[PDB]
Amino acid sequence: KRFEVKKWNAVALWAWDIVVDNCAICRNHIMDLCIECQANQASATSEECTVAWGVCNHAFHFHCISRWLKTRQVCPLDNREWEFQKYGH
Amino acid sequence: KRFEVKKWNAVALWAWDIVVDNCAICRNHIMDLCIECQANQASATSEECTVAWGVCNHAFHFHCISRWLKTRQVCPLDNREWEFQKYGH
Amino acid sequence: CGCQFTSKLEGMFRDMSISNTTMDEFRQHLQATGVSLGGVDLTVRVLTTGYWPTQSATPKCNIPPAPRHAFEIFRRFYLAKHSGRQLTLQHHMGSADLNATTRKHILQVSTFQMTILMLFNNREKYTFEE
Amino acid sequence: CGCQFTSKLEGMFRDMSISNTTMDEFRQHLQATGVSLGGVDLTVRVLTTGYWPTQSATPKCNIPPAPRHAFEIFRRFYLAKHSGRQLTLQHHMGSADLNATTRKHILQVSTFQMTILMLFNNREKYTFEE
Ligand SMILES: [Zn+2]
Ligand SMILES: [Zn+2]
Ligand SMILES: [Zn+2]
Ligand SMILES: [Zn+2]
Ligand SMILES: [Zn+2]
Ligand SMILES: [Zn+2]
């Protein structure tokens, strides 16, 4: 051949079993609102109902784990202190 | 085809990095005597200079780790309590 | 007989637990990947050298290519998930279910006749020399 | 600034440490199997979604077959050893060294021109439509 690849420097991103189809706290989805918001509008009045990403690569609705912080303080699928490293998908 | 295999029940045996070519205590081999025996006969007078297998699947000369039990009591390549589950290769 | 001897038996049972846990884990990971998995039901058991003595001299032969590929994939999975160890091949242990074919009757081979019957499948009319 | 965003930077450095450790581990495990001629040289890293934002929309395009096989190998190895590290496929990151051939001068592609040049290698005289 005329051109051949010798080295590769790909970067691999990983995500845990967040179950994009069932929120691990509310069991609706990784998007499309939550149990306490339901309808899309539901008198939104600004604020937000996006996805929250932790330091453990877990994803839930911001509302779900914001409320869950009052019940416990360690991400339910593990035993790690939950951070708020990202907001939204 | 006339005969096709559907199920298989193979049993896999595993061994740790015992370094069959260098004893992790004396650095001679996994066989062929040890540092304090050297020559094959060396006034053997019965007794034994075989291989000792632990509960952690580590293998050294019986003489080497028998002497090493006086220096420490946790297998050097790990932090496990060393057993004597087998004698010889 | 004393707990001094039953301790090894308890360790053997712990090894059995480890083997079945690793088996279900490898099945779950094959559900996501499992490229080389010729043996459909790869029931692979992981044991430790100390508990179970070597049969005679750790045998080797013309293992069937589909079970060869299945065992290779299982060993690669086991050497990755459980790192720090090496997997050996042997034949004097285990069993298998051979699906034969008027109905489809499934036979059984105890990891001894798999190579001979695979050679027969590749080409019949063999003998001891073959 | 204080221990508000510097903690995030320390976490990013920890992620860098994790990435290089996983890289050397995957190189060591590649030294073991060596099946196909696609893993000749691999400086692949492992990052977490939270630390590093997604580039645009995670591009998913035709990758070259040798690099494609290499990435498959990497993904499988990771999901087995560090079970839970499902490698997503992206292209807006990384680089590569293309060995061209009067001497043998090695070019460099930042994971963008690899697919186009691979298509050229498969068949020259292409255009935008191709
Ligand atoms: Zn939810
Ligand atoms: Zn909501
Ligand atoms: Zn978590
Ligand atoms: Zn020694
Ligand atoms: Zn000796
Ligand atoms: Zn040990």
For chain B, what is the total number of helices (H) and then of strands (E)? 1, 5
In sign, the C-alpha dihedral spanning B22, B24, B30, B34 is: positive
At which residue do the structure tokens 């190998």 appear? Answer: D73
Task: For residue D118, give both structure tokens.
Answer: 């691979």
Structural determination approach: cryo-EM
| Touching subunits for chain D (3+ Cβ pairs under 8 A) | A, C
The C-alpha angle A42, A47, A53, rounded to 5 degrees, equals 105
Q: Is A64 annotated as a binding residue?
A: yes
B59-61: strand order across its sheet:
B59-61, B51-53, B86-87
Q: What phi-psi label fits residue D125: left (phi over 0), alpha (psi between -120 and 50 degrees) or beta?
A: left
Angle, nearest 10°, between helix axes C65-81 and D6-33? 150
Q: Which residues of C33-62 are buried (b: 16+ CB within 10 A; e: fewer)?
A: bbebbbbeebbbbbbbbbbeeeeeeeeeee
Closest CA–CA distance from residue D34 to any residue of chain A (Å): 15
Alpha carbon distance B56, B83 (integer Å) = 8
D and C touch with 3+ CB pairs <8 Å, answer: yes
How many angstroms is it from B61 CA to the middle of ligand 5? 7
- DSSP secondary structure code for residue B81 in this structure: B
C contacts of B13 (beta carbons < 8 Å): 46-49, 52, 87-88, 90
Output the DSSP codes for A9-75: --EEEE-----TTS-TTTSS-SSS--TTT-SSSSS--S----EEE-TTS-EEEHHHHHHHTTT-SB-
B contacts of C43 (beta carbons < 8 Å): 7-10
Instruction: List the one residue out of C20, A61, A83 whose CA is nearest residue D10.
Output: A83
Residue in A4, A13, A53 closest to D99 by CB: A4
Output the DSSP codes for D58-122: ----PPPHHHHHHHHHHHHHHHHHTTT--PBP--SS--EEEEE-----EEEE-SSSHHHHHHHHH
Angle, nearest 10°, between helix axes D65-81 and D6-33? 110
Alpha carbon distance C83, D81 (integer Å) = 7
Alpha carbon distance A7, A4 (integer Å) = 10
Three-state SS letters, C87-127: EECCCCCCCEEEEECCCCCEEEECCCCHHHHHHHHHCCCCC
Alpha carbon distance B12, A16 (integer Å) = 29
Phi/psi of residue D26, nearest 5 degrees? -70, -35
Q: Which residues of C69-102 are buried (b: 16+ CB within 10 A; e: fewer)?
A: bbbbbbbbbbbbbbeebebebbbebbbbbbeeee
Phi/psi of residue A52, nearest 5 degrees? -115, 130
Alpha carbon distance C76, D5 (integer Å) = 41
A contacts of D101 (beta carbons < 8 Å): 2
Residue in A5, A16, A85 closest to D96 by CB: A5
Contact, C39 vs C77, CB < 8 A?
Answer: no
Residue type, B53: W
Closest CA–CA distance from residue A89 to any residue of chain D (Å): 9
Q: Is B49 annotated as a binding residue?
A: yes
Alpha carbon distance C9, B75 (integer Å) = 22
Helix (H) or strand (E) holding B65: helix B62-68
Closest CA–CA distance from residue D129 to any residue of chain A (Å): 22
At which residue do the structure tokens 């999901």 appear? Answer: D79
Complete domains list, chain A, with CATH: 1-87 (3.30.40.10)
A contacts of D45 (beta carbons < 8 Å): 9-12
